[PDB]
């Protein structure tokens, strides 16, 4: 109880589509629309880095 203090409770929305659209060019940015529909067609593929 000596050490405890009220912490600033915060919330943040994280958009997976935006994050995967935003990663550096050498990591290969991609929106999930054009890889979700193609990895479902064949599961042996991979996307992102």
């Amino acid at each position: 109880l000596k050490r405890d203090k009220r912490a600033l409770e915060v919330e943040r929305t994280v958009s997976l589509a935006e994050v995967y659209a935003g990663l550096p060019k050498d990591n290969g940015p991609f929106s999930l629309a054009q890889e979700i529909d193609k990895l479902v067609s064949q599961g042996s593929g991979s996307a992102g880095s």
Partner: protein, 49 residues
Amino acid sequence: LYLPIYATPADPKALLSAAVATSQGGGKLPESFMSLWRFPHMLENARGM
């Protein structure tokens, strides 16, 4: 011819014992700390302690 006088020992001395007392300095209150709980809860806490 002279009959000597004979000395009678006196009663034994009453042994006495000394009983002294000890004194110790009183304590001092530590530094009070601001809590997080409201008074009824910090009181149920302290009362338990």
